[PDB]
Amino acid sequence: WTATSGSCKGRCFELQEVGPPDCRCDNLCKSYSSCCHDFDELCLKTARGWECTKDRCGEVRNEENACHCSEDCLSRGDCCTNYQVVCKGESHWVDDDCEEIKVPECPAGFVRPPLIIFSVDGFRASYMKKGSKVMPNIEKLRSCGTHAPYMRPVYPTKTFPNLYTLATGLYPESHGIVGNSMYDPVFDASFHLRGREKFNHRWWGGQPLWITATKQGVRAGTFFWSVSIPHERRILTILQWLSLPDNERPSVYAFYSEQPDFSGHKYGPFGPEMTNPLREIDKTVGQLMDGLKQLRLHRCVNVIFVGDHGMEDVTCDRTEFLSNYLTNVDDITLVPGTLGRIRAKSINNSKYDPKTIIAALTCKKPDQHFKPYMKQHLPKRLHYANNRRIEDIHLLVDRRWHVARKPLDVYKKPSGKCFFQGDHGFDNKVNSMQTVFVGYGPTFKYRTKVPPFENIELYNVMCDLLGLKPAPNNGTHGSLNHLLRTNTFRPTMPDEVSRPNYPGIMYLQSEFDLGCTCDDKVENKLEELNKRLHTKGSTKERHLLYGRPAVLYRTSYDILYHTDFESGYSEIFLMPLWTSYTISKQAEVSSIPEHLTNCVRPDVRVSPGFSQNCLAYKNDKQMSYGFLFPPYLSSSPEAKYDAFLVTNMVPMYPAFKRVWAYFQRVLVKKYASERNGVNVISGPIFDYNYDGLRDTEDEIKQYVEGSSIPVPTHYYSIITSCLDFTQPADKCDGPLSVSSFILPHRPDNDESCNSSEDESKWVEELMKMHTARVRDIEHLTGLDFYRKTSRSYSEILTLKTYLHTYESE
Ligand SMILES: *[C@@H]1O[C@H](CO)[C@@H](O[C@@H]2O[C@H](CO)[C@@H](O[C@@H]3O[C@H](CO[C@H]4O[C@H](CO)[C@@H](O)[C@H](O[C@H]5O[C@H](CO)[C@@H](O)[C@H](O)[C@@H]5O[C@H]5O[C@H](CO)[C@@H](O)[C@H](O)[C@@H]5O)[C@@H]4O)[C@@H](O)[C@H](O[C@H]4O[C@H](CO)[C@@H](O)[C@H](O)[C@@H]4O[C@H]4O[C@H](CO)[C@@H](O)[C@H](O)[C@@H]4O)[C@@H]3O)[C@H](O)[C@H]2NC(C)=O)[C@H](O)[C@H]1NC(C)=O
Ligand SMILES: CC(=O)N1CCC(c2[nH][nH]c(=O)c2/N=N/c2cc(C(F)(F)F)cc(C(F)(F)F)c2)CC1
Ligand SMILES: [Ca+2]
Ligand SMILES: [Ca+2]
Ligand code: NA
Ligand code: NA
Ligand SMILES: [Zn+2]
């Protein structure tokens, strides 16, 4: 109940929300059906439209007008945005040459430059180039300020998850807005775009920017605008708020536009109808900047122009139907469209089985346009699993496609045709899903291009721009320092928590009873001192190029040196946490020799009690083993024996070994040839609770049968070289280049529908799908990489957030 018979007189777009049943006059009151009776009349004036004309200049104030052209309007803060242009001979902001904003030029009483977030729904990254001729205000922001060629949204690339990620710095699995539609099994409640459940605070986790600001004494404009409030009124409201007395005036504001997304759904991303929405958005930016200029704030405010996601061509004929795959389609609930999420229709149905649903959906049609995954098997870069609102079965849908349960869900009578031509929601690495970032103002750099970055990073920067301490989030604070003229955030590297042991030769061969064998009994002061030096770390400078990784948790581990590689060996997990080696451009690939095929050698530096054993592998009929440093890349026949040490061994399913062996035998050398040497760091990852974070020992669900050897859920590699590829990886003077992956350690290759073919036809495709940031691997391992480089720490933070996408231009 609302007692809608209070009044909005003097309350229009009030910033404090009044509680039920008293009536509201804030920018969201319409959405709640709660506005006072006179809200439209007083707060939503339209009379005479939005622009001054020559005949209106100097008019007697008429309080009925949408905006004012009277002499008093500047001091009232309610002129039409083009007032000084029409009436005082001033220029539009877009027509002024740009001039560097070296310092804030703010009116007296401003404590800090205000921030205005100008958010545009469905603004695909390529609109900035493709629509530049029809967006002159936006193009001036972009060319004069700081811009990225694109900004990566979070998955799913839907509106609510991305807008709340912008506000919080959190992945959707952590903030809880995991789709536009959701069912929470604990609340037994559903969240929908339409309706009232979405206003309940229990959906919305983390701490959004407006709460962070308010807690720290920085006033915030109300971020959300009821759909029916025209954009011109949104802009005039922000400009009016900026004219408030210092003690009342917010420091942070948000504008939102439902375009170009609204039209993009109807017409496709590049439909000829799309030109007009882009023109209209540019006009709104122009109104804002002209309005700021009239208030002498155009060289004071930091403006962020930012989208939530892009837009792809999708039509209803490109729909896959689950009823073409499942016999039991009526026993499931599907959240459909550009991603699929499946759960049981009824919790009382004991015949429901996700294993049989996955199998029925796996590689069933030659050009099948979705792929089913248990959520823990989704690429880790998606960070899309650790929330009870995310169903266990997920369908990753190919770009340009939909999935639906039955054809009747898609068509409507009488004709059966559908009219949409665009959609979004796909994997966040897809080019059509990329969106925009421009920052313009005294705190941003001048005429500066920055590399693409993820929208999870922006919360930290918005906190920096407002002098706020960010709540804990998934950004890497400092990684966007290169966007900023000032207010940079200068973090210190985390402290190493566990220091390594450096064991020497402590055990005799006969102390080991591991059931291993090796034909190595094959027989010099010259060369013997040489081998001893390698074991003491004489080659470590070649193979550990950026320092040893730091271990950020409490554990017991050993550093082990060899001719061709260095490793940090865990006495708790019985395998390396990391193995580091450099392969030059000139390196040669060799085979595993016949006499060494089944060779595993005890490591006399590490006790039998802290070693794996071969008998476990012999007894475990599902599990084989691989090596982290590849024997194929040994520098000499003699050095190759090091690669067969039990301390270089890791558990691997035979199916996974196909992947691994191809990576090690073929792809590493290929990358070294292409990149002028590579440094490789590889290792295991244990994430049995799929929370994106390193498992402790007591979270491990699977061991090599009969043993205490834990089975990794994933294997990673970080592959680093010189950004200037004219310099070899091991003699690089300047910035670095990296690509990494986190491959799922699966006992089958069902994910790869072409896996019966030669590995040259499917393995690299798998690896691209599972591309990763170094930062993802840090979370998953508790290691901190690149500790010793010549580079600035912020530069290294940027490097650690890099994702190699494998998408064309
Ligand atoms: C991305 O960045 C974020 C932010 O930094 C990272 O997320 C953090 O990760 C931490 C570790 O997983 C986690 O810390 C836990 O906090 C628990 C208290 O949590 C509440 O309070 C905080 C603070 O205000 C709040 O943020 C939380 O909000 C979550 O939960 C509500 C639901 O109430 C949601 O609305 C909200 O969206 C958010 O949900 C997300 O996180 C939860 C986990 O907290 C998930 O379950 C959801 O799926 C969703 O992802 C909470 O309201 C605290 O209880 C935990 O402590 C337990 O574990 C420690 C280990 O140190 C142990 O010592 C304790 O004893 C305790 O164990 C006891 O409880 C266990 C569980 O019942 C039980 O098994 C034991 O036997 C014990 O009894 C823990 O410290 C922190 O909450 C989140 N924060 C957020 C905002 O998500 C995230 O990791 C980053 N991602 C990556 C990949 O880096
Ligand atoms: C129909 C639809 O698809 N809907 C429902 C209406 C909703 C909407 N209408 N009017 C608005 O102003 C607005 N959202 N504005 C923001 C802006 C930000 C930002 F400033 F950070 F960018 C964050 C958020 C938050 F949701 F994440 F909280 C919301 C848009 C999604
Ligand atoms: Ca959107
Ligand atoms: Ca974990
Ligand atoms: Na075996
Ligand atoms: Na397969
Ligand atoms: Zn949309």
- The three state secondary structure string of 564-633 is CCEEEEECCCCEEEEEEEEECCCCCCCCCCHHHCCCCECCCCCCHHHCCCHHHHHHCCCCEEEECCCHHH
| Sign of the Cα pseudo-torsion (290, 257, 227, 220, in order) | negative
Residues around the ion ligand 7 (C-beta < 5 A): 261
Residues with Cβ within 6 A of ligand 1?
Answer: 170-171, 173-176, 205-206, 383, 386-387, 472-474, 691-693, 779
Q: Which two tokens stand for residue 105?
A: 């030029």
E strand or H helix at 769, and its extent? Answer: helix 763-769
| Residue 615 Cα distances to 513, 627, 628, 680, angstroms | 9, 17, 20, 30
Residues in the chain: 809
Closest alpha carbon to 131 in 237, 277, 259: 277
For the CA of 202, the closest atom of ligand 1 is: 35
- The tokens 């807690």 sit on which residue? 215
Ligand nearest to the CA of 707: 5
CA distance linking residue 438 with residue 461, whole number of Å:
13
Ligand nearest to the CA of 755: 6
390, 384 contact by CB (below 8 A) = yes
* Helix 159-168 and helix 458-466, axial crossing angle in degrees, nearest 10: 40
Q: Which CATH number fits domain 509-801: 3.40.570.10, 3.60.10.10, 1.10.540.10, 3.30.1450.10?
A: 3.40.570.10
* 687 annotated as belonging to a binding site for a ligand: yes
For the CA of 261, the closest atom of ligand 2 is: 3
Q: Count of CB atoms within 10 A of residue 145's CB?
A: 24
Give the end-to-end CA distance of the chain in Å, rounded to a whole number.
54
CA distance linking residue 189 with residue 166, whole number of Å:
25
- Nearest residue (CA) to ligand 2, atom 19: 163
For the CA of 224, the closest atom of ligand 2 is: 12
E strand or H helix at 140, and its extent? Answer: helix 136-144
Task: State if residue 225 touches ligand 2 by the CB under 6 angstroms criterion.
Answer: yes
Over 312-328, what HEC string results?
Answer: EECCCCCEEEHHHCCCC
Q: For 256-334, where are the alpha helices, taking DSSP H only?
A: 261-267, 275-294
Q: How many CA atoms lie within 13 A of 414 on its CB side?
A: 0
Phi, psi angle pair for 684, to nearest 5°: -85, 160
Cα 160 to ligand 2 centroid, rounded to whole Å: 7
> Is 647 among the catalytic positions?
no
Write down the experimental method used for this entry. X-ray
Closest alpha carbon to 115 in 474, 468, 472, 477: 468
Cα 779 to ligand 4 centroid, rounded to whole Å: 9
Which residues, other chains included, contact 556 with Cβ-Cβ below 8 Å and sequence gap of 6+? 498, 501, 570, 571, 572
CA distance linking residue 657 with residue 680, whole number of Å:
18
| Sign of the Cα pseudo-torsion (530, 535, 541, 542, in order) | positive
* 770 annotated as belonging to a binding site for a ligand: no
Cα 225 to ligand 2 centroid, rounded to whole Å: 8
Q: Is 404 helix (H, G, I), strand (E, B) or coil?
A: strand
* Cis before 414? omega within 30: yes
CA distance linking residue 319 with residue 331, whole number of Å:
20
Q: Give, for ligand 1, the residue of 160, 170, 171, 174 to mutate: max count of ligand atoms closer than 8 Å to Cβ.
A: 174
Angle at CA of residue 575, ends 571 and 581, nearest 5°: 120
Ligand nearest to the CA of 221: 2
CA distance linking residue 306 with residue 165, whole number of Å:
12
* 309 annotated as belonging to a binding site for a ligand: yes
| Residue 477 Cα distances to 129, 461, 683, 797, angstroms | 29, 8, 26, 8
Q: Which two tokens stand for residue 354?
A: 């996700």
Classify strands 453-454 and 151-152 as parallel, antiparallel or unpaired. parallel
Q: Which of 4, 81, 157, 159 is catalytic?
A: 159
* 695 annotated as belonging to a binding site for a ligand: yes
Task: State if residue 222 touches ligand 2 by the CB under 6 angstroms criterion.
Answer: no
Closest alpha carbon to 549 in 782, 797, 792: 782
* 261 annotated as belonging to a binding site for a ligand: yes
Residue 505, judged by CB atoms within 10 A of its CB (0-12, 13-18, 19+), counts as exposed
180, 193 contact by CB (below 8 A) = yes
Closest alpha carbon to 219 in 105, 304, 114, 118: 114
Q: Which two tokens stand for residue 508?
A: 């005799």
Region of 722 on the Ramachandran plot (φ > 0 left; ψ -120 to 50 alpha; else beta): beta
Q: Which two tokens stand for residue 49?
A: 């439209």
Q: How many CA atoms lie within 13 A of 420 on its CB side?
A: 22
CA distance linking residue 383 with residue 455, whole number of Å:
14
CA distance linking residue 704 with residue 710, whole number of Å:
6
Which residues face 423 on adjacent strands?
Answer: 312
Q: Is 501 helix (H, G, I), strand (E, B) or coil?
A: strand
Cα 163 to ligand 2 centroid, rounded to whole Å: 6
Residue 570, judged by CB atoms within 10 A of its CB (0-12, 13-18, 19+), counts as buried
Q: Specify the amino acid at residue 114.
A: P
Q: Which two tokens stand for residue 604?
A: 């006399």
CA distance linking residue 575 with residue 626, whole number of Å:
11
DSSP-assigned letter for residue 184: E
* Helix 774-781 and helix 793-801, axial crossing angle in degrees, nearest 10: 90
| Residue 787 Cα distances to 496, 545, 784, angstroms | 10, 10, 7
CA distance linking residue 541 with residue 544, whole number of Å:
6
Classify strands 146-147 and 437-440 as parallel, antiparallel or unpaired. antiparallel
Q: Which residues of 195-215 are buried (b: 16+ CB within 10 A; e: fewer)?
A: eeebeeeebbbbbbbbebbee
Q: Specify the amino acid at residue 578.
A: W
Give how far the C-alpha of residue 447 lies from the chain's centroid of Cα atoms, to the nearest Å: 26
694, 778 contact by CB (below 8 A) = no
Which residues face 117 on adjacent strands?
Answer: 254, 304
Closest alpha carbon to 768 in 717, 805, 737: 805
Closest alpha carbon to 780 in 738, 745, 735, 736: 745
Residue 160, judged by CB atoms within 10 A of its CB (0-12, 13-18, 19+), counts as buried
Cα 307 to ligand 3 centroid, rounded to whole Å: 8
